[PDB]
Design a protein around this ligand. Sequence first.
Ligand SMILES: [K+]
Lengths: 51, 51
Amino acid sequence: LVSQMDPHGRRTIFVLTKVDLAEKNVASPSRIQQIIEGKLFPMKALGYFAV
Amino acid sequence: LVSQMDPHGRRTIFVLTKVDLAEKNVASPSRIQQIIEGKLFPMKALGYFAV
Ligand SMILES: [K+]
């Protein structure tokens, strides 16, 4: 939806919701490190990725 | 995909993972009960089981 709006992230900030559910499920912080870096988020959202 | 390859509910069985999150209300309990009953499938399904 967003990568077709602004693929450079200039018009968007990436947020996360329910990251505690990662701890309730087997936690993979290595996937979180990619999350903060936006490797798996095509829109390349700008700003700090709040949770 | 299964709604097109198995619209008749002859092969496809849906299984719900993270059943413990229905207890915590992390995932909507109402939509969990409906998927157990099968009201939320746009197709026929072979069955449903809890993971
Ligand atoms: K929900």
